[PDB]
């Protein structure tokens, strides 16, 4: 039996809005530790891994390790029927063919109960090694979304170059080219408004702006985004879900 209760229901709402367009189907792995999801998109160029720790839920219970095959389009439909201040509880039986999502309003006068069919999946799951990377930039999530959105109008691919001082994004298309250059914030007040760069080696990498713009749908989960780069290997885009976990997006590079 699995039972998890979340007073900040909007969190799960955001999570599925962050996922549903990139991935149609995913496996949800339930344990005593919490919820983990990992999935490649249909083209296999990108990868998502979600982690929600059991200490983040108001109450959490897991008897058996559980693997639920879920249509993400469907889970999103269900969660769009929740208000942002609903208390959301997830629940499954030991032999559950469905997952139960129960939404509670703050007046005890409205309660919604939804029941989702699970599905058989034949997934392709990956081994994600812990490396250390040559470059880590941390910046406003909103700034990053803006950049990816704007430059996508210029050309298909963005070139990201890390230096000690700051970071540069560049794209090219039929019309010409653009360079957006962010320096390290020199006078630092608030964490999330700042641009901070920590680097061992200069990185220069090329990515598809198409995919990044899926990623930036996660922007409402956090004020900040962290970008992790190493030469010729997938980029990692990380959003912290505060004091509960994270969504990490990986992106296969162009050469």
């Amino acid at each position: 039996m699995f039972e998890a209760r979340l007073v900040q229901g909007s969190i799960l709402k955001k999570v599925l809005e962050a996922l549903k367009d990139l991935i149609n189907e995913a496996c949800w792995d339930i344990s005593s530790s919490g919820v983990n999801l990992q999935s490649m998109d249909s083209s296999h160029v990108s990868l998502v891994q979600l982690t929600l720790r059991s200490e983040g839920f108001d109450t959490y219970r897991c008897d058996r390790n559980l693997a639920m095959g879920v249509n993400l389009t469907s889970m999103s439909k269900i969660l769009k029927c929740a208000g942002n201040e609903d208390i959301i509880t997830l629940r499954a039986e030991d032999n559950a063919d469905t997952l139960a999502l129960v939404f509670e309003a703050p007046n005890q006068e409205k309660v919604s109960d939804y029941e989702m069919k699970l599905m058989d999946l034949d997934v392709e799951q990956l081994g994600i090694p812990e490396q250390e990377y040559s470059c880590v930039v941390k910046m406003p999530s909103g700034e990053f979304a803006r950049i990816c959105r704007d430059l996508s109008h210029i050309g298909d691919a963005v070139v990201i170059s890390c230096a000690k001082d700051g970071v540069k994004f560049s794209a090219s298309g039929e019309l010409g080219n653009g360079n957006i250059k962010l320096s390290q914030t020199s006078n630092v007040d608030k964490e999330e408004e700042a641009v901070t760069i920590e680097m061992n080696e200069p990185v220069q990498l090329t990515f598809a702006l198409r995919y990044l713009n899926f990623f930036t749908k996660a922007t409402p989960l956090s004020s900040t985004v962290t970008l992790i780069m190493s030469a010729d290997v997938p980029l990692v885009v990380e959003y912290k879900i505060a004091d509960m976990g994270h969504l990490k997006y990986y992106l296969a590079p162009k050469i």
Binding site: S43, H44, V45, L121, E124, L126, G127, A252
Partner: peptide, 18 residues
Amino acid sequence: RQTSMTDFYHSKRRLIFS
């Protein structure tokens, strides 16, 4: 040329039954 994630990481297949 655009690489895929399997160019970097090993791939186990998995069967979920629901």
